[PDB]
Amino acid sequence: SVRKRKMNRSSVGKATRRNKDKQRKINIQSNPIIAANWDYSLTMAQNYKKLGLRAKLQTPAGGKETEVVKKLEELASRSQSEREEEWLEKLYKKHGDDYKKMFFDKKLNIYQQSEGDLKRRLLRWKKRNG
Amino acid sequence: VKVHFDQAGKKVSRRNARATRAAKIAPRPLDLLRPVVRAPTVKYNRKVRAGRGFTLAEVKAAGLTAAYARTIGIAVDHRRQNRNQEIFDANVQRLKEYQSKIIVFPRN
Amino acid sequence: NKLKRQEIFADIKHEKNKERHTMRRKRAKEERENPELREQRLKENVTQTIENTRVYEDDLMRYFNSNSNEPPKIFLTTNVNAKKSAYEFANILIEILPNVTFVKRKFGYKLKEISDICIKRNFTDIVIINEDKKKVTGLTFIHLPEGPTFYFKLSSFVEHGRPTSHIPELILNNFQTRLGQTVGRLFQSILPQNPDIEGRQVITLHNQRDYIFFRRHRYVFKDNERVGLQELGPQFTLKLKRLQRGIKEETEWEHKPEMDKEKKKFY
Amino acid sequence: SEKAGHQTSAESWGTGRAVARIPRVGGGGTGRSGQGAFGNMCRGGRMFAPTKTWRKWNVKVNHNEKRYATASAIAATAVASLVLARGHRVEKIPEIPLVVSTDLESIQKTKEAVAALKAVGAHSDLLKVLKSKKLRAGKGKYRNRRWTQRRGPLVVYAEDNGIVKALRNVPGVETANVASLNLLQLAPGAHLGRFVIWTEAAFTKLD
Amino acid sequence: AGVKAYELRTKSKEQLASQLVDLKKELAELKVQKLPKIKTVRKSIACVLTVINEQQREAVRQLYKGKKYQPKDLRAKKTRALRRALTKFEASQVTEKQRKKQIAFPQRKYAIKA
Amino acid sequence: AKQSLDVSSDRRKARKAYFTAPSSQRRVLLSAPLSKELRAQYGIKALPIRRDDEVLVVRGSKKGQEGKISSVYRLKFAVQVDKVTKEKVNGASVPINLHPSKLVITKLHLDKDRKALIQRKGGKL
RNA sequence: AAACUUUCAACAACGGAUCUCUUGGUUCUCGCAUCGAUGAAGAACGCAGCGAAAUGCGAUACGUAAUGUGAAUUGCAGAAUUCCGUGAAUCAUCGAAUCUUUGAACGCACGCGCCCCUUGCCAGGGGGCAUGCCUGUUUGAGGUCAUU
RNA sequence: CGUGGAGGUCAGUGACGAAGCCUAGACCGUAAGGUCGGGUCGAACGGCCUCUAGUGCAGAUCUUGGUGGUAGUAGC
RNA sequence: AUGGUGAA
RNA sequence: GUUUGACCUCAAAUCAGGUAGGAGUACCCGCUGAAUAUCAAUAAGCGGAGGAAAAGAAACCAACCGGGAUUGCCUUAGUAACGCGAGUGAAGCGGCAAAAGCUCAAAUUUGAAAUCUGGUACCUUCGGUGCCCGAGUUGUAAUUUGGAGAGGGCACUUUGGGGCCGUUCCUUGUCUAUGUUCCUUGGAACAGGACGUCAUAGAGGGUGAGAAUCCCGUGUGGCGAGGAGUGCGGUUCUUUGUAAAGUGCCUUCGAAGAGUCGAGUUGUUUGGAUGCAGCUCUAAGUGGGUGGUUCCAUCUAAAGCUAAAUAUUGGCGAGAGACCGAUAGCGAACAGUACAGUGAUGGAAAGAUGAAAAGAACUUUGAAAAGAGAGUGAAAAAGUACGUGAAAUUGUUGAAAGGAAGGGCAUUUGAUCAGACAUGGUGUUUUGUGCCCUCUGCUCCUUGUGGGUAGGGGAUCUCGCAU
């Protein structure tokens, strides 16, 4: 093409980019355990078999736990606001454990919380504080 | 007139793309678990084949939800109904095996 | 671009030639009125010829060469399996050498045997012509006592006057170098040493760089103190080779193809 | 190029001008005008039967026939006379087929692999290679086919430990796996009887 | 040879203008003769002008420091198509519902062996 | 054999690159091996040549001649050595063009950049 | 006979046919998306000491700004260099400037107007004033409703 | 029989001269052609089994390039 | 036939 | 009110913040479009985008024990179907490549338009905050998109943001082996032989002719410098707010794209009878669309977004060819240049000197062409008309022959070319030797009708050689 010949003749120079080799090489970037054990010399399927993992869940087309223990071991590696705490304390003082009476408190139960929610919050407060 | 000189090139590109996906998706197997399917067209009904995704009923019977199942690598298809007990049982067993074989890392 | 290069230089050469011609004409015209300036310019401009750029015992003569006290008998033969051309050249050898005896090659008498037989017969020198094709290519000369010998390559052999019976006069040129004068002495002792000037016969050897030209001419003088000459038949050029210094032992100057690169010293 | 030759405006003059009816470029002044165009016989014209890209390049071969050819090539290596007729200097091999210990596969340095090959008897073939290296004859000199040389010994291994890399640099020597056993390498030029060196582990795995 | 830019960086506007005027006068004087010094003075003039322009541009940037909608001259020259193609923040914008869904069921990392 | 997929062994491409290589690359191209005596001293095989570097002639008709270099003709890929000159018919003396690859450096010219390069290339001083 | 017509060996002219090669063309394969009012492609005029083509550049004009290399460039003259050094190359990278008149071409047109400002009635000096449409600010005019 | 290219083989040929060209030189064959003797030339080419094709010219009022009689003529 | 060129 | 305000509408400003043309065009999308069936939804023309575009998660395919986004390939298949004539020609299923689902309209946040654009001052600046201005109520946020979903109650489960270093990617510099040893030739050794060394480096190029070891380079690793990002592992500050979601159960409710579907007619496409398109009319909500023997099977159109496998003769950057070789290959290896045309357009010819110019110093004849000497140079049978120089054709020397010549059979004469460094073989007779006689040894296999190699003694000796 005309533009290609002009660029070749121009003294600006080509913006050379060499990345063919980088297409073959891909570094694992989603797990630290695999990276230490992964071997780039082998293929994806071979690497998965070496690690002890499945690279395909469906019957693959065409013909065909020393590391998983680390993954399993890797598996073994909220409170109440101050205003919420004060509101809970007020109701607890005014009604104690009388959940039914606490429900009908018009001027302390500003939000009509259910008996279950009130008792759960009070139990959480008691466990956290007493 | 198109000649598939790139056949080898296309295969190499597909392999490189799969390797890149594995590098990004190293922990996972690159595939979503698919259910067993019986085909229509009696000429092929004898053949059992993989489907798109498990039905909502199968996912419920497997002890997990579709929203949670998708995040674990289970294909969910809400369009397919269920009219065969054997296929439903096979899909449930496959899902149970998948759940018993999968390992999930903590989010912490 | 070929066209640009050809056109540019074509015009350049024309202008250069024009300038050279104009300068030469002006210089000649101005020198006509100033003759001394021409002499000064000629003195300041040397032609730098190849000749001008050259890059820098009585017992021996008697012992390794013939002398007038005894005429030298020269043994003439030919290499084995010789043919008509060799005998034709031997005819000229007889016509030019003083005392020659021709003997057919016996094909098996070693060089030592030939030398012994020649000593038995009191021969003085051995000359043998060698051929490869139907042409003479080389010539050799060996002296019997102490075995000083020389080997010469032959080229440009060409067959117009008829030489007389008189012995041609011997003249040598350009043998200043020590090696050259050895070949000059060989020629002076192999060719007749008794001039018979009457009959105006002359034989000349003329070396320029490495080749020696042998020719015969008749010379006649005129009142203008100049001598004219006419070709007396054969043309001959020779090239010295192998300078054995013995019958076949202890070569001293044998030429090598690797030489001649210097372009000078004219061995 | 398909567009080659078509990049010219020319039309036939028909008759009456007492000239060839081949179409000629119009216009004037340039000089190309009046010259033949579109003709295979014309200078700079459209070559007859241009080579198209959809010509057949690969040949389908039955898998069974391919295996038969590979088996025949492998068998041919067992005959010393057949291998000798192939041009390999196997006159000094201690045994045929040549069987070597598996430790050969573990060699990492070419200096040791070449010494082992020389000691076992392959020295003659290695000398034959690197000697017949001659410059390419014909126009191939400047098509990346500049140099050519005779094939060297073939090494067959069951597992790769470094021998494939150690032997790649020594000219003539080639390494292949028992599973592959390339026919193009076993019988280069369609000529059977290549000098092949096998490891005892590879010898067992051949069965 | 000639003036050095690293020396002219610290010169003031008035000093740079005086140097430029002197160099222009020298060039005008040399033009009458018609001589590599002409090239040196020409290069010095260009260097002084470039230094002055650089100082002026940084001053303009300083006066427009931090405030929105700076002059288009100082704006990025990347390309016409990159001023469009909504910036990173706009592209990353996500509805609250999608964020809630992602938080509730984030994509998990897992392997299938046991 | 070459294993990298980013490097091409094409004769045409290499020839084009060599002839069209810029002066910066030609500097690397015009390398000259060091003398065996100098190799032991600096522990380096070859270094780029420069003006003041002293070199020895190992090939060509001028074999055995030595002298201080005077110019590095990068455009012509040739270098000039002092006292190595031709004699024209008119008496004018023209330096003979020599290739650095056919010459051996006998005495290097030491500068700060050359000293840094020597250390960079594993040498010693 | 000489002269002259014709066949052939040698010598002396055309042309580059044969042989060798190429910073070329063509074809196959692979990575990526990269023009423009913050002024695209294209055209005209100028710039190197000497200049045909090509390339580069825009009155900062075969370049200016910045980093790497470390001692050049070269057809000729010319420069130097403190060259143990913030430093030369027509070197490489290239993110900072300049970027003549046209050209989507953009003040009005088929010559030629206005805001601005300035250093000295009047002028040098510096940037803009083209048409379609989106959001916001300013002004002006006109239909409904209110006006105890 | 011959040519462009490719796989194989001659541990082939070659600056002590490969290819091409010339040659009132010779040998071989019924021939496509091969080989050797001598001159210019300079750097690549060939003996043989296969594969491959833009593979072999006496003309197509055939294409490019080159040169003769016409003719030192018509004519200027 | 498609798209353009100049021409009263 | 013989007035003053709310808006709505319409104009203007050298207003502030913005975008649009056009270029390129191989591929993509739409319109149009030739030379009643065929070239043909081609050629040409116009408009609109990107690295891909379009399409895309069914008013689907099927009548089966059913499959479940779109896209590309094989298969289906040259079959069904049609024009039954030449001919055109599908699609489901099946296998493969790659897989991801979502967002609005629809039912009250009304116990708080909770939403958003712009101006202003800061900071940690592809943005955040305090304030103001304006849009919004003729609806801006959250909650729901049929897989249902929403208000409540019962046992429970869960949770994010910003910096730092590493990690990965892009740009880019650098380190990382061995002869120039000897001999022959050559102008030059990069040619042959001998002696050597490295090889995860014998791919390639340059160096006075074919170079691993002369250089640049290549194999593998190390050391750096400048940018991207949160694909993630540590590191550090924060959360909070009676905040937002999920699981199972009980309870009360529970919306769905109209000048749209559809029929009629007229133009158009299909091998499909479908679809596209001017216009009269114009549909229903346990409703509507697609298919068959009483209807049974499957979805919910008249809104939109979405990477992947898919095309690619343009652009940038790379790896290669059983490709062509200056009359080939792109028209152009030194050109879209010279040149022709008022114009749209057409459009060429041309590569190589020599290692290097060492490009003929200098003398000499010519107004000028270039000659003769002279020299450089491996060569001038390489002199810038330069790597090599055949025919057609032209001039000279020589031979021959003479209103023609050309070829075949056989031969004379003239000229001229080849025409064995063949110099042997046999039996006999002296002399000196060894591998020959004898004595004494060493060494390789296997084992054998052998091979190789030594130290003492002679001419029983022709076993061979030389005389």
Coordinates of N, CA, C and O in Angstrom, one line a residue, chain D residues 3 27 74 89 171 192:
Chain D
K3 N -4.8 -8.8 -9.0 CA -4.8 -7.4 -9.6 C -3.7 -7.2 -10.6 O -3.8 -6.2 -11.4
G27 N -3.8 6.5 -24.9 CA -3.1 7.7 -24.5 C -1.8 7.9 -25.4 O -1.8 7.4 -26.6
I74 N 10.5 -48.4 10.7 CA 11.1 -48.9 11.9 C 11.8 -50.2 11.7 O 12.9 -50.4 12.1
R89 N 27.3 -44.2 8.2 CA 28.6 -44.9 8.5 C 28.4 -45.7 9.8 O 29.0 -45.4 10.8
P171 N 25.2 -30.9 15.0 CA 24.5 -31.1 13.7 C 24.3 -32.5 13.4 O 25.1 -33.4 13.7
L192 N 14.5 -45.9 3.2 CA 14.5 -46.6 4.4 C 15.9 -46.9 4.9 O 16.9 -46.8 4.2

